[PDB]
Write a protein that binds this ligand. Structure first.
Ligand SMILES: NC(=O)c1ccc[n+]([C@@H]2O[C@H](COP(=O)([O-])OP(=O)(O)OC[C@H]3O[C@@H](n4cnc5c(N)ncnc54)[C@H](OP(=O)(O)O)[C@@H]3O)[C@@H](O)[C@H]2O)c1
Ligand SMILES: NC(=O)c1ccc[n+]([C@@H]2O[C@H](COP(=O)([O-])OP(=O)(O)OC[C@H]3O[C@@H](n4cnc5c(N)ncnc54)[C@H](OP(=O)(O)O)[C@@H]3O)[C@@H](O)[C@H]2O)c1
Lengths: 357, 357
């Protein structure tokens, strides 16, 4: 069996990493939980066993086979190269290594083949990208993809545990104390690293991550660049608007595509239904469609509202929902780890390709 | 001065119609408040005056110069034609008369010219449509509009008082009582008339109004048809996805357009800023963009996140927010009444063009 390290075990994703590993088929001989210095000493469960949390350092990875990183891009930049040097295979949830050409950016249902040539780090894509890839791959396979326009409806748990708590307390202040939403005090949202913070209670914040130089945010540009890498097709036009709404968990997306050939809607529904990881929830006569509150706790990605554009021959609209901490993060990572096991790819990398910092 | 009747004075829009009329330049000699049998005999203020609510009937409109209707489609279908027969000019905030060729469908800043030929009923468009027209008309004027794709983020007050109360109580049950969102009992949303109801708390429901036979909802098809009528251009392609989110007031929209001629973004920003009723809130260096919580209580429509599509030469994305009870309903209606007065159009229509039910 393996020694498996969860780096960021105390966070929003880390908690779900623990659950997914507890429910995994991966043969685990030893589990280790790693976090920051201030979490060291604390205990946390793996099944009915008590695990002491350890501080993440350059020397903490000796004897580890697989490390699942979910501790911020900075922690991955600092320690993942040391893990690879120690002979670990890292599965990283952060954005840091995603666009490195020596690093496979993987959704196992779409591009598992990319794992074969890994150099010790596999990147899990952005949550909003993953669920879109699960919904759209079956369509691309049969009719191609020319362009995507997406508007997202993203849950606050995507911003971490602190963002969940900020949201709940803001809502309680409005509903229980009568505070006007626009008078609320925020510390984290829309983006913890940015200069200004805004209330999310009864709001829709059209900013996720910080702004890039082309006036799209990094979140929107991640959807663009990650789609092209995962689908290994730079000709797919992708533009996004990424919005935070007062949902605790599960992202929703209004997705517009134009295919290369006309894709009959009943066939599109059937292709999506048949694709692993995608569930068709589409029966408008009975008001059936994906909903965030229904998707929470499921590894599946739910697709509905599927209909042709009113004017564009090859245009199709749909609605895509998935749990951002599961398929969007911890489940995608555990799936990758299971696939690495299945393919005999859990072993040390001889050549180190990532700079030690 | 005028005798003005507010039909549906007790509802979410009605309350704002009162506020807008109180703050209006319209010379008002007498105010009457009409509603259903449920509210008849109760009292509401107009400024310091107590006004007794009257049950709406076919004979309640004698002596009324202007009637503002915001009491549901059925109420307008039943009583507006009797008001017109009695010599009233009706400003109607329902969908019922919007597509009737004898009824101007008006946003004053866009198509006030259409008022001149009114036959006793002027329809106020759908809230989500109004704010999109204020944002897009200045762009259309200079560069044309070929197509629109919109995904909305609509507030619950759009579905009335009952839906506001339903949302507040659901959120209180989750936050104070520890109820799981999935275990909440809903009675109104997504659509009071439809067969099944779902929780909105911590959810995003991709259904507003009921479904039509093309699998778009009536809300989505209204954005399509109303746009074409208001802009007097059936060639504009419009497809919409309309989603309810947990916001009490103010709709937000992710709007994609393709213009007929390339529209430089800095010029688009200037044109929107210069357009009456539209305010540019767009400075990403300081995280300035429209927000629902900021728009509440303002008659203006706010536009930002303005940026070119990453691939389509003539494509532009933006974020449009307005208070759905103000510019989306009560302010647009009172603005229409003010414009009618300015143009000498508050007077009886000799010929009845509407069926009596
Ligand atoms: N949330 C989502 O839906 C989602 C989806 C896809 C990808 N991700 C990525 O997942 C990563 C984790 O996000 P989250 O939402 O789980 O954040 P979170 O709830 O704030 O948790 C942060 C975790 O990072 C750990 N950490 C912080 N600094 C550390 C350090 N210097 N050394 C070791 N551990 C450190 C924290 O440990 P302590 O408790 O000791 O501080 C905590 O375990 C982020 O990079 C995020 O971009 C998140
Ligand atoms: N809310 C928005 O943002 C928005 C935007 C664009 C268009 N609209 C339209 O505005 C209209 C009202 O919306 P709302 O959100 O304010 O609804 P609401 O809060 O439910 O209010 C309903 C109003 O209709 C009155 N009413 C019901 N049945 C009646 C009857 N038989 N005769 C006379 N009055 C009756 C009610 O009076 P009681 O108190 O006696 O029941 C109440 O005053 C609807 O047609 C809606 O489609 C709303």
């Amino acid at each position: 069996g393996y020694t498996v390290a969860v780096v960021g075990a105390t966070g929003a994703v880390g908690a779900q990493m623990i659950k997914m590993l507890e429910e995994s088929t991966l043969p685990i001989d030893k589990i280790r939980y790693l976090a920051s210095a201030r979490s060291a000493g604390k205990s946390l469960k793996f099944k009915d066993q008590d695990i002491t949390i350890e501080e993440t350092t350059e020397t903490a990875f000796e004897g580890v086979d697989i490390a699942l990183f979910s501790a911020g891009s900075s922690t991955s930049a600092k320690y993942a190269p040391y893990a690879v040097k120690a002979g670990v295979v890292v599965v990283d949830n952060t954005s840091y290594f995603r666009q490195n050409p020596d690093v496979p950016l993987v959704v196992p249902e779409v591009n598992a083949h990319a794992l074969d040539a890994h150099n010790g780090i596999i990147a899990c894509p952005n949550c909003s990208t993953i669920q879109m890839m699960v919904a759209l791959e079956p369509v691309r396979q049969k009719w191609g993809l020319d362009r995507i326009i997406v508007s997202t409806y993203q849950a606050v748990s995507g911003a971490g545990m602190g963002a969940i708590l900020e949201t709940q307390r803001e809502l309680r202040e409005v509903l229980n104390d009568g505070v006007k939403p626009c008078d609320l005090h925020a510390e984290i949202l829309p983006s913890g690293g940015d200069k200004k913070h805004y209330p999310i209670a009864f709001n829709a914040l059209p900013q996720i991550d910080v702004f890039t130089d082309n006036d799209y945010t990094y979140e929107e540009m991640k959807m663009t660049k990650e789609t092209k890498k995962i689908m290994e097709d730079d000709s797919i036009a992708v533009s996004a608007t990424c919005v935070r709404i007062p949902v605790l968990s599960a992202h929703s997306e209004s997705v517009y595509i134009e295919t290369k050939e006309v894709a009959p809607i009943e066939e599109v529904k059937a292709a999506i239904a048949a694709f692993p990881g995608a569930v068709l929830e589409d029966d408008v006569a009975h008001q059936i469609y994906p909903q965030a509150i229904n998707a929470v706790g499921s590894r599946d990605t739910f697709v509905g509202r599927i209909r042709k554009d009113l004017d564009a021959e090859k245009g199709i609209h749909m609605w895509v929902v998935s749990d951002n901490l599961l398929k969007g993060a911890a489940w995608n990572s555990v799936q990758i780890a299971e696939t690495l096991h299945e393919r005999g790819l859990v072993r040390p990398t001889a050549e180190l390709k990532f700079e030690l910092k």
